[PDB]
Every structure is written in C-alpha cells, then in structure tokens.
Amino acid sequence: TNTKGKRRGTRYMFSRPFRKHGVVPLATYMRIYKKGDIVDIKGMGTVQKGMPHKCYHGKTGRVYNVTQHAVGIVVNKQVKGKILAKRINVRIEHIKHSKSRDSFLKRVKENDQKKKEAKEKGTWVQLKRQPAPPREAHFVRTNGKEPELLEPIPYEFMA
C-alpha cells in the first residue's frame, strides 16, 4: 500500500515556480487579514514553518483567528460521505486573499448606489444578473462583395 507521510506526492505541489526561487517578496508579509475574510490556501515550500497539509492546497476558507505570525482558518474537507468544517493554523506565507468575494462586495456597493439613486426618479432598473439571453434579430449587410466559396482541399500526404 502507500505511505502515510505528511508530504507524500508533493514534489510538484510544494515546489517553487520556474525562475521564482529565492527571497519571498515582502508584500505577502505586509498584508492585513482580519476576522472573517475569505482566503485561499497555497502551500509554499520556501518556508517550512506552519505549512498546511497537502489536502488543503487550493482550498478556500474563512479566517476566524489572527495571531502574531499565523492565521487560523475554517475550511471544509470532504471525508468519505460527510464534509467537516475544520479549523487549521497556517503561517502567513502560504495564504492569499481570495478575489472571489471582492467582486461580490463591489457589486453590492454598486447596485445599492443605483438603488438609492432613481428612487426619487421612480424609474425601473434591473439588478439581478440575468443569464446570457439569446441573440436578437439583426441585419448582416453585404457591401456588394459576394461571399466566397469554401471547398474541402484534396487529400495529399505530408509525412
């Protein structure tokens, strides 16, 4: 059977990208994580302290505790037929703010603003994101040039 080591099969997952080894850029250290941010997990092999287990690599969780160097986050893990929301502590290098939430936040601010506006105007405005509707009817103008014929080319071997 296999081995139950903590880092089995991570030679590519925890490795560094090509031509990106060396000193960790300081912007990663200079970011602020508060209680309740949605955050992504991406193990970085450069630092070995507080490295998350390989099964949380690429997972997104919620911050619930902030500490000197690390952050505690609640993340869902599918174990057999059930999902457990378990909390793990990850050092700040292996973490990154999720941009999936800021889009929704900006949308909230923007449609709240356009709801506050036009409230006095009384006009109607659409807020829900409708799915891509079918294309409407239109005209395709030929400019006096007729469409050119397309025919299959004859078979002839290359190799």
Partner: protein, 48 residues
C-alpha cells in the same frame, strides 16, 4: 485463500443515497481555539 484487497466501488453511491450534507453553518460560532489574551480582553470588555 486469497481475497480482494481494497476497493471503493459502491462508496459514492452509498454516500449520495443519503446526501453529503454541508456542515450546519450558523451565526454566533464558538470562541474556542481563539488567542487566549485576546479572549481575556473580550471577557474584560464584556464585564465592564
């Protein structure tokens, strides 16, 4: 007397016929596992 060693052939069906329920998310989550000194502060603030 050999025998089959390991399989997961029916496991997905077994899990799904009752459904993989997400954890019961709900407001006011517990405060266990939080930094002790920050917790001590929050207790003092609530007290006063």
């Amino acid at each position: 007397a050999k025998s089959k060693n390991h399989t997961t052939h029916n496991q997905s069906r077994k899990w799904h016929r009752n459904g993989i329920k997400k954890p019961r998310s709900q407001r006011y989550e517990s405060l266990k596992g939080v930094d002790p000194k920050f917790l001590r502060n929050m207790r003092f603030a609530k007290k006063h």
